[PDB]
RNA sequence: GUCGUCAGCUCGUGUCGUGAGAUGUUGGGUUAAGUCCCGCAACGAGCGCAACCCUUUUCCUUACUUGCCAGCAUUUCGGAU
């Protein structure tokens, strides 16, 4: 399930942000700048990506869970489709504060979320009139978009995967607080300090996020033990 | 009584701070209204608001006296009978 290197170049993982927005911690990985924007070498990208795939494969073999996290407008549908394909839940929309550090309250949220979904499946929602029914339906989309991923979880995920560390810094802080390992793609302008498995590459490119999510979903599915 | 029928006042778990504390109530529209919707390290609640109570406007059912008189009849022309 390795990504070779040529796939990374054809996707465009080497492109990064402008030199003026860089984070000095990525000096080792940047390797140079072709233009006023940084270009990261894939020679460092491929081994870390393969190691992340291996770790995810081992975790899936042990049947432990890897949560998906992508919120950017570019990678939202990518994490949508690939996490649905892999059967590993996700945080597609805005990362609500305290998901992991305040799980005791979110268990209740998942609770009447599931109860109202079961009511929608049942004929209970058929009895009441149209206005109140539409009110509860609006409540249903409102709750589902925020907590659609978390309903499957029965506990804290064993690992996290992150599309943008800066954009999902709150999730990184929560994972550091509770000790969950994090694998996230870290761009030029990003801080890799709290990421256990640092895979450096572009996160704006739809091709790049598609490649990353597809490869990780392939590894998770190919655990198969 | 008054501000004044003014629209605000409080609580839980998480985060931030050595700490007293803070967050949530924050911005853009709209409404009599913290009324509602989008935004938003916060998510959710409770009291306030609104509604439940009385009265008025249209119609239906029950009830036909001490109240009513469309049709019939008698009229002292007064539902008087």
Tab-separated table of C-alpha atoms (C1' of nucleotides) in Angstrom:
chain	number	residue	atom	x	y	z
A	1	UNK	CA	0.000	0.000	0.000
A	2	UNK	CA	3.074	2.211	-0.277
A	3	UNK	CA	2.888	5.492	-2.192
A	4	UNK	CA	6.270	5.099	-3.949
A	5	UNK	CA	7.099	8.773	-4.667
A	6	UNK	CA	5.895	9.297	-8.242
A	7	UNK	CA	2.313	9.425	-6.973
A	8	UNK	CA	3.365	12.167	-4.551
A	9	UNK	CA	4.957	14.215	-7.340
A	10	UNK	CA	1.952	13.761	-9.630
A	11	UNK	CA	-0.382	14.826	-6.816
A	12	UNK	CA	1.762	17.835	-5.926
A	13	UNK	CA	2.848	17.201	-2.325
A	14	UNK	CA	6.140	19.017	-2.911
A	15	UNK	CA	4.530	22.460	-3.158
A	16	UNK	CA	4.321	24.436	0.079
A	17	UNK	CA	3.456	27.872	1.370
A	18	UNK	CA	5.407	31.059	0.734
A	19	UNK	CA	8.847	31.449	2.288
A	20	UNK	CA	7.679	34.336	4.480
A	21	UNK	CA	5.069	32.144	6.219
A	22	UNK	CA	7.376	29.208	6.966
A	23	UNK	CA	7.894	27.605	10.373
A	24	UNK	CA	11.616	27.331	11.213
A	25	UNK	CA	11.086	23.827	12.636
A	26	UNK	CA	10.523	22.516	9.088
A	27	UNK	CA	14.018	23.607	8.021
A	28	UNK	CA	15.228	19.999	7.893
A	29	UNK	CA	12.342	18.896	5.659
A	30	UNK	CA	12.062	21.937	3.366
A	31	UNK	CA	15.346	21.218	1.510
A	32	UNK	CA	14.942	24.289	-0.700
A	33	UNK	CA	12.686	26.725	-2.533
A	34	UNK	CA	12.304	26.755	-6.318
A	35	UNK	CA	10.456	30.098	-6.206
A	36	UNK	CA	9.092	32.472	-3.528
A	37	UNK	CA	7.278	29.376	-2.191
A	38	UNK	CA	8.961	26.436	-0.485
A	39	UNK	CA	9.340	23.051	-2.176
A	40	UNK	CA	9.697	20.103	0.197
A	41	UNK	CA	11.681	17.067	-0.916
A	42	UNK	CA	9.688	13.841	-1.140
A	43	UNK	CA	12.791	11.858	-0.154
A	44	UNK	CA	11.840	12.625	3.447
A	45	UNK	CA	8.114	12.283	2.738
A	46	UNK	CA	8.024	8.691	1.448
A	47	UNK	CA	9.725	6.949	4.431
A	48	UNK	CA	7.613	8.726	7.051
A	49	UNK	CA	4.459	8.069	5.021
A	50	UNK	CA	5.350	4.375	4.772
A	51	UNK	CA	6.011	4.258	8.524
A	52	UNK	CA	2.629	5.869	9.215
A	53	UNK	CA	0.943	3.333	6.934
A	54	UNK	CA	2.732	0.512	8.767
A	55	UNK	CA	1.628	1.849	12.157
A	56	UNK	CA	-1.980	2.160	10.982
A	57	UNK	CA	-1.823	-1.355	9.522
A	58	UNK	CA	-0.578	-2.784	12.827
A	59	UNK	CA	-3.275	-0.910	14.760
A	60	UNK	CA	-5.991	-2.191	12.412
A	61	UNK	CA	-4.590	-5.709	12.801
A	62	UNK	CA	-4.943	-5.298	16.568
A	63	UNK	CA	-8.459	-3.901	15.805
A	64	UNK	CA	-7.661	-0.654	17.620
A	65	UNK	CA	-9.233	2.471	16.158
A	66	UNK	CA	-7.748	5.381	14.204
A	67	UNK	CA	-9.993	8.450	14.085
A	68	UNK	CA	-9.989	10.595	10.936
A	69	UNK	CA	-9.786	14.399	11.263
A	70	UNK	CA	-10.165	16.774	8.334
A	71	UNK	CA	-11.999	20.103	8.454
A	72	UNK	CA	-10.528	22.147	5.584
A	73	UNK	CA	-12.936	22.913	2.754
A	74	UNK	CA	-10.541	21.129	0.390
A	75	UNK	CA	-10.237	17.790	2.219
A	76	UNK	CA	-13.701	17.588	3.813
A	77	UNK	CA	-15.217	15.408	1.082
A	78	UNK	CA	-11.987	13.417	0.777
A	79	UNK	CA	-12.026	12.404	4.446
A	80	UNK	CA	-15.788	11.861	4.067
A	81	UNK	CA	-15.402	9.308	1.282
A	82	UNK	CA	-12.189	7.615	2.390
A	83	UNK	CA	-13.229	7.201	6.028
A	84	UNK	CA	-16.576	5.817	4.867
A	85	UNK	CA	-14.660	3.396	2.628
A	86	UNK	CA	-12.365	2.333	5.487
A	87	UNK	CA	-15.181	2.088	8.039
A	88	UNK	CA	-13.336	4.304	10.518
A	89	UNK	CA	-15.250	7.283	11.940
A	90	UNK	CA	-14.295	10.850	11.447
A	91	UNK	CA	-14.617	14.518	12.343
A	92	UNK	CA	-15.699	16.109	9.069
A	93	UNK	CA	-17.128	19.470	10.157
A	94	UNK	CA	-15.799	21.918	12.767
A	95	UNK	CA	-13.931	20.205	15.603
A	96	UNK	CA	-16.150	20.842	18.608
A	97	UNK	CA	-14.215	21.727	21.750
A	98	UNK	CA	-13.634	19.029	24.329
A	99	UNK	CA	-14.490	15.981	22.205
A	100	UNK	CA	-11.877	13.772	23.870
A	101	UNK	CA	-11.210	15.606	27.155
A	102	UNK	CA	-14.958	15.863	27.914
A	103	UNK	CA	-16.162	12.563	26.453
A	104	UNK	CA	-18.496	11.974	29.417
A	105	UNK	CA	-20.792	14.757	28.204
A	106	UNK	CA	-20.545	13.865	24.504
A	107	UNK	CA	-21.660	10.327	25.307
A	108	UNK	CA	-25.021	11.872	26.214
A	109	UNK	CA	-25.043	13.827	22.944
A	110	UNK	CA	-24.455	10.593	21.038
A	111	UNK	CA	-27.207	9.163	23.254
A	112	UNK	CA	-30.261	11.102	22.186
A	113	UNK	CA	-28.717	11.466	18.735
A	114	UNK	CA	-29.078	7.691	18.383
A	115	UNK	CA	-32.471	7.771	20.112
A	116	UNK	CA	-33.846	10.388	17.710
A	117	UNK	CA	-32.368	8.543	14.724
A	118	UNK	CA	-34.189	5.413	15.908
A	119	UNK	CA	-37.353	7.495	16.303
A	120	UNK	CA	-36.936	8.738	12.724
A	121	UNK	CA	-36.620	5.121	11.595
A	122	UNK	CA	-39.724	4.291	13.646
A	123	UNK	CA	-43.256	5.608	13.220
A	124	UNK	CA	-43.051	7.843	16.298
A	125	UNK	CA	-42.115	10.889	14.208
A	126	UNK	CA	-45.107	10.184	11.959
A	127	UNK	CA	-47.652	10.997	14.673
A	128	UNK	CA	-46.867	14.650	15.405
A	129	UNK	CA	-47.892	17.501	13.115
A	130	UNK	CA	-45.813	19.006	10.328
A	131	UNK	CA	-44.414	22.118	12.035
A	132	UNK	CA	-43.028	20.305	15.078
A	133	UNK	CA	-41.801	17.522	12.789
A	134	UNK	CA	-39.888	20.050	10.687
A	135	UNK	CA	-38.449	21.588	13.860
A	136	UNK	CA	-37.113	18.212	14.995
A	137	UNK	CA	-35.804	17.523	11.483
A	138	UNK	CA	-33.809	20.767	11.522
A	139	UNK	CA	-32.519	19.717	14.938
A	140	UNK	CA	-31.621	16.368	13.356
A	141	UNK	CA	-29.438	17.831	10.610
A	142	UNK	CA	-27.924	20.283	13.112
A	143	UNK	CA	-26.932	17.472	15.485
A	144	UNK	CA	-25.918	15.036	12.739
A	145	UNK	CA	-23.498	17.362	10.944
A	146	UNK	CA	-21.651	18.070	14.196
A	147	UNK	CA	-21.724	14.544	15.658
A	148	UNK	CA	-22.177	12.228	12.666
A	149	UNK	CA	-18.758	10.649	13.091
A	150	UNK	CA	-18.669	10.146	16.855
A	151	UNK	CA	-21.818	8.014	17.205
A	152	UNK	CA	-19.939	4.810	16.346
A	153	UNK	CA	-17.262	5.413	18.992
A	154	UNK	CA	-17.789	3.557	22.251
A	155	UNK	CA	-14.574	4.945	23.698
A	156	UNK	CA	-11.593	7.158	23.061
A	157	UNK	CA	-9.887	6.382	19.725
A	158	UNK	CA	-6.545	4.622	19.963
A	159	UNK	CA	-4.943	6.973	17.425
A	160	UNK	CA	-5.698	10.141	15.477
A	161	UNK	CA	-5.045	11.170	11.869
A	162	UNK	CA	-4.924	14.872	11.015
A	163	UNK	CA	-5.171	16.700	7.689
A	164	UNK	CA	-4.061	20.108	9.019
A	165	UNK	CA	-2.296	20.390	12.373
A	166	UNK	CA	-2.635	24.180	12.579
A	167	UNK	CA	-6.314	24.058	11.626
A	168	UNK	CA	-6.970	21.210	14.092
A	169	UNK	CA	-4.623	22.425	16.823
A	170	UNK	CA	-7.362	21.929	19.433
A	171	UNK	CA	-7.559	18.222	18.588
A	172	UNK	CA	-3.762	17.972	18.786
A	173	UNK	CA	-3.853	19.571	22.241
A	174	UNK	CA	-6.565	17.161	23.411
A	175	UNK	CA	-4.626	14.171	22.067
A	176	UNK	CA	-1.476	15.379	23.828
A	177	UNK	CA	-3.498	15.806	27.026
A	178	UNK	CA	-4.886	12.260	26.971
A	179	UNK	CA	-1.848	10.511	25.471
A	180	UNK	CA	-3.367	9.372	22.161
A	181	UNK	CA	-0.770	9.152	19.354
A	182	UNK	CA	-1.297	11.472	16.389
A	183	UNK	CA	-0.362	10.955	12.741
A	184	UNK	CA	-0.883	14.158	10.791
A	185	UNK	CA	0.372	15.683	7.570
A	186	UNK	CA	2.543	18.693	8.400
A	187	UNK	CA	3.029	21.451	5.829
A	188	UNK	CA	5.792	24.061	5.583
A	189	UNK	CA	4.044	26.655	7.780
A	190	UNK	CA	3.097	24.075	10.426
A	191	UNK	CA	4.290	23.109	13.905
A	192	UNK	CA	5.269	19.425	14.241
A	193	UNK	CA	6.000	19.636	17.968
A	194	UNK	CA	3.113	17.508	19.277
A	195	UNK	CA	2.784	15.040	16.375
A	196	UNK	CA	4.063	11.547	17.168
A	197	UNK	CA	4.315	10.461	13.510
A	198	UNK	CA	5.286	13.492	11.426
A	199	UNK	CA	4.653	13.006	7.703
A	200	UNK	CA	5.641	16.230	5.898
A	201	UNK	CA	3.747	17.251	2.775
A	202	UNK	CA	1.194	19.532	1.190
A	203	UNK	CA	-2.278	19.747	2.723
A	204	UNK	CA	-3.980	22.261	0.410
A	205	UNK	CA	-3.825	20.025	-2.666
A	206	UNK	CA	-6.985	17.987	-3.197
A	207	UNK	CA	-4.862	15.407	-5.022
A	208	UNK	CA	-2.492	15.216	-2.047
A	209	UNK	CA	-5.211	14.772	0.577
A	210	UNK	CA	-6.931	12.211	-1.653
A	211	UNK	CA	-3.672	10.265	-1.933
A	212	UNK	CA	-3.020	10.367	1.820
A	213	UNK	CA	-6.547	9.386	2.846
A	214	UNK	CA	-6.786	6.640	0.213
A	215	UNK	CA	-3.439	5.145	1.249
A	216	UNK	CA	-4.336	5.165	4.941
A	217	UNK	CA	-7.773	3.674	4.253
A	218	UNK	CA	-6.090	0.974	2.167
A	219	UNK	CA	-3.722	0.150	5.030
A	220	UNK	CA	-6.552	0.039	7.588
A	221	UNK	CA	-8.645	-2.244	5.376
A	222	UNK	CA	-5.602	-4.394	4.548
A	223	UNK	CA	-4.933	-5.064	8.221
A	224	UNK	CA	-7.293	-8.041	7.904
A	225	UNK	CA	-6.454	-9.916	11.119
B	1	G	C1'	-44.750	52.365	45.347
B	2	U	C1'	-40.695	53.188	41.775
B	3	C	C1'	-37.061	52.463	37.814
B	4	G	C1'	-40.640	49.458	34.402
B	5	U	C1'	-43.564	45.437	31.215
B	6	C	C1'	-36.862	47.619	31.558
B	7	A	C1'	-34.553	42.807	29.254
B	8	G	C1'	-31.889	40.725	31.454
B	9	C	C1'	-30.223	37.106	35.657
B	10	U	C1'	-28.104	32.473	36.826
B	11	C	C1'	-25.928	26.672	36.626
B	12	G	C1'	-22.898	21.748	35.112
B	13	U	C1'	-18.384	19.202	32.727
B	14	G	C1'	-14.287	20.588	30.177
B	15	U	C1'	-10.137	24.298	28.798
B	16	C	C1'	-6.946	29.031	30.194
B	17	G	C1'	-4.473	31.463	34.604
B	18	U	C1'	0.429	30.628	40.502
B	19	G	C1'	-4.061	33.130	41.867
B	20	A	C1'	-8.800	36.057	42.733
B	21	G	C1'	-11.173	34.656	38.212
B	22	A	C1'	-12.386	34.017	32.806
B	23	U	C1'	-15.020	31.281	28.650
B	24	G	C1'	-19.875	30.284	27.554
B	25	U	C1'	-24.174	35.505	27.239
B	26	U	C1'	-19.080	36.465	21.932
B	27	G	C1'	-20.145	38.930	16.059
B	28	G	C1'	-23.868	39.445	11.248
B	29	G	C1'	-29.268	39.663	10.200
B	30	U	C1'	-34.359	39.944	12.417
B	31	U	C1'	-37.996	40.571	16.420
B	32	A	C1'	-42.383	43.587	21.591
B	33	A	C1'	-38.586	40.341	23.487
B	34	G	C1'	-31.457	36.839	25.534
B	35	U	C1'	-37.667	36.092	19.733
B	36	C	C1'	-35.288	33.129	16.130
B	37	C	C1'	-31.401	31.897	12.402
B	38	C	C1'	-26.095	31.979	10.653
B	39	G	C1'	-20.901	32.885	13.112
B	40	C	C1'	-18.165	31.388	17.329
B	41	A	C1'	-12.697	26.240	23.215
B	42	A	C1'	-16.431	25.506	24.182
B	43	C	C1'	-21.202	22.269	24.583
B	44	G	C1'	-25.497	22.196	27.050
B	45	A	C1'	-29.423	23.834	30.679
B	46	G	C1'	-33.002	26.882	34.360
B	47	C	C1'	-35.654	31.475	35.568
B	48	G	C1'	-37.084	35.743	32.866
B	49	C	C1'	-39.920	36.506	27.087
B	50	A	C1'	-44.068	33.831	24.734
B	51	A	C1'	-48.152	30.418	25.926
B	52	C	C1'	-51.530	28.311	29.636
B	53	C	C1'	-56.295	32.198	32.602
B	54	C	C1'	-60.635	36.206	31.693
B	55	U	C1'	-63.353	39.211	27.977
B	56	U	C1'	-64.761	40.676	22.704
B	57	U	C1'	-65.456	39.294	17.079
B	58	U	C1'	-67.674	34.305	13.184
B	59	C	C1'	-70.023	29.461	13.341
B	60	C	C1'	-71.934	24.580	15.726
B	61	U	C1'	-74.297	21.369	19.770
B	62	U	C1'	-77.381	21.216	24.289
B	63	A	C1'	-81.104	23.921	26.842
B	64	C	C1'	-86.919	26.847	25.526
B	65	U	C1'	-88.599	30.245	30.981
B	66	U	C1'	-89.734	34.757	33.924
B	67	G	C1'	-86.809	35.527	27.844
B	68	C	C1'	-88.195	35.271	21.775
B	69	C	C1'	-92.529	35.754	17.709
B	70	A	C1'	-90.895	33.615	11.468
B	71	G	C1'	-95.504	30.681	10.003
B	72	C	C1'	-101.200	29.582	11.648
B	73	A	C1'	-105.531	31.223	14.247
B	74	U	C1'	-108.281	34.835	17.671
B	75	U	C1'	-107.833	39.653	18.523
B	76	U	C1'	-110.172	44.659	23.338
B	77	C	C1'	-104.721	45.653	17.758
B	78	G	C1'	-101.493	45.586	23.511
B	79	G	C1'	-96.940	38.307	22.320
B	80	A	C1'	-102.801	40.546	24.588
B	81	U	C1'	-104.584	34.868	23.711
